[PDB]
């Protein structure tokens, strides 16, 4: 007999996992850990128990001005992130420029809730002025309409008196006020609606001070409109007063938004649909349920997410080189 023997050896198994090293690629190993998350549920979920704000057919501009083609939201909403559909068919419907529109979007990125309230009641705030002005540019059910948050002031009985209206912010939170300035394409329309040629609009607060004058010129038709409406906004601090002064061309605010600030929010564009689910991490493609450090799903993330990388694979070896032969 050869005699008794003792041998030193190492483990092997039927694993087919492969990793790369600096010296050699495609190494079959006994054990390994995947560090790259690539799976998502393909749905829009609640974030930390809070549902997002879905604007549906509207973009931010369409919702804030109150486009009549979009389903109206509840007067009070609270959310964790904002979703815009890729096909936002409803935005600004009367052609014009939305001044500092992008800055207003970034402001809304840190907003957690809004309350929609009548800053200037329709049948209380504008005596001696017509408030029924509509347009085919903002249609609703085949009929001419207007923004739900604004009021087109025009002449009443051959005159447009100099209006002077003000609101004191008593809500205890910042209040977002939006208004418009109309620019007729010819001076004949300027008299018909506002009865004054040297019209002006003045909007003042403690930290806002701007004056607007109509600019009259023939323009290419946009949405069958040769006129233009410039949209403006400001954030009224708690306890502050906003004063509106005009003798024409003012698209007066009617509804305003009391806003609450929050953390970790943002605006994303998603084709996905809302579902009854909860996640700690949301992407425009779907929600991630992972404790892994990396992900290659999407760079846009809401919440507590793995770091986005371009890698196709990140596998760390923990076991040995697998040699079952």
């Amino acid at each position: 007999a050869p005699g008794d023997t003792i041998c030193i050896g190492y483990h092997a198994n039927n694993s087919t996992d492969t990793v790369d090293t600096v010296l050699e690629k495609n190494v079959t190993v006994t054990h390994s850990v995947n560090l790259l998350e690539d799976s998502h549920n393909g749905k829009l979920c609640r974030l930390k128990g809070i549902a997002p704000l879905q604007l549906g057919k509207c973009n931010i501009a369409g919702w804030l001005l109150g486009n009549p083609e979009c389903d109206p939201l509840l007067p009070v909403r609270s959310w964790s992130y904002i979703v815009e559909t890729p096909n936002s068919e409803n935005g600004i419907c009367y052609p014009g420029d939305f001044i500092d529109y992008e800055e207003l979007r970034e402001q809304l990125s840190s907003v957690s809730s809004f309350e929609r309230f009548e800053i200037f009641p329709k049948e209380s705030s504008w005596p001696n002025h017509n408030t029924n002005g509509v347009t085919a540019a903002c249609s609703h059910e085949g009929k001419s309409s207007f923004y739900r948050n604004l009021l087109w002031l025009t002449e009443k009985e051959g005159s447009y008196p100099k209006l002077k209206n003000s609101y004191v912010n008593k809500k205890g939170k910042e209040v977002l006020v939006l208004w418009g300035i109309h620019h007729p394409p010819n001076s004949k329309e300027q008299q018909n609606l506002y009865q004054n040629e040297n019209a002006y609009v003045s909007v003042v607060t403690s930290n806002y001070n701007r004056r607007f004058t109509p600019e009259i010129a023939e323009r290419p038709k946009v949405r069958d409109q040769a006129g233009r409406m410039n949209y403006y906004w400001t954030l009224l601090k708690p306890g502050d007063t906003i004063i509106f002064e005009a003798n024409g061309n003012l698209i007066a605010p009617m509804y305003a938004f009391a806003l609450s600030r929050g953390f970790g929010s943002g605006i994303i564009t998603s084709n996905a649909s809302m579902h009854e689910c909860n996640t700690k991490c949301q992407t425009p493609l779907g929600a991630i349920n992972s404790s892994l450090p990396y992900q290659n799903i999407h760079p846009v993330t809401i919440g507590e997410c793995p770091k986005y990388v371009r890698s196709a694979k990140l596998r760390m070896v923990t076991g040995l080189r697998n040699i079952p032969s």
């Binding site: 008794d4 030193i8 190492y10 092997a12 790369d20 846009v300 986005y308």
Partner: protein
């Protein structure tokens, strides 16, 4: 490998050893079987676990990161924002892949070192009471039963106990 044990003078691994990463196979008159070395296997588990957790811990949680919008007269700022986002993405992708590659080579060598150290630990225990028959095996110059085998698997081999026997067989 770097230390010459795995895929070196021990050519292959053992599918029959399921308990641990490293261990022993014995053959005496009482039978044969596989037995993992719990001390060295457990030590390698803890180090690699800390090593995995170290990589995960160094990566912070990615909090909310969304896009921004710029008007037609802000192309410069838009491109700067894109240059920032792409630049950070370039760096983190480079860091993640490289760290995994560098650390994978270290793990394989770490296992390679452990096998050699275990082999060398047994060799210094047995001295000339057994012979290196290659492939990581020792042929005893004396009868070694289950109790004797266990004394080699742990660190309590009594060299003087079997030295007189082993010398006679070694002749």
């Amino acid at each position: 490998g770097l230390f010459g044990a795995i895929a070196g003078f021990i050519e292959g691994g053992w599918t029959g050893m399921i308990d641990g990463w490293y261990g022993y196979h014995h053959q005496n008159e009482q039978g044969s079987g596989y037995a993992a070395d719990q001390k060295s296997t457990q030590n390698a588990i803890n180090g690699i676990t800390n090593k995995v957790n170290t990589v995960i811990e160094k990566m912070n949680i990615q909090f909310t990161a969304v896009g921004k919008e710029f008007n037609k007269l802000e192309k410069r700022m838009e491109n700067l924002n894109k240059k920032v986002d792409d630049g950070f993405l370039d760096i983190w992708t480079y860091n993640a892949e490289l760290l995994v590659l560098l650390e994978n080579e270290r793990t394989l060598d770490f296992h390679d070192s452990n096998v050699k150290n275990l082999y060398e630990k047994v060799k210094s225990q047995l001295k000339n009471n057994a012979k290196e028959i290659g492939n990581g095996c020792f042929e005893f110059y004396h009868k070694c039963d289950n109790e004797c085998m266990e004394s080699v698997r742990n660190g309590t081999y009594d060299y003087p106990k079997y030295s007189e026997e082993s010398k006679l067989n070694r002749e």
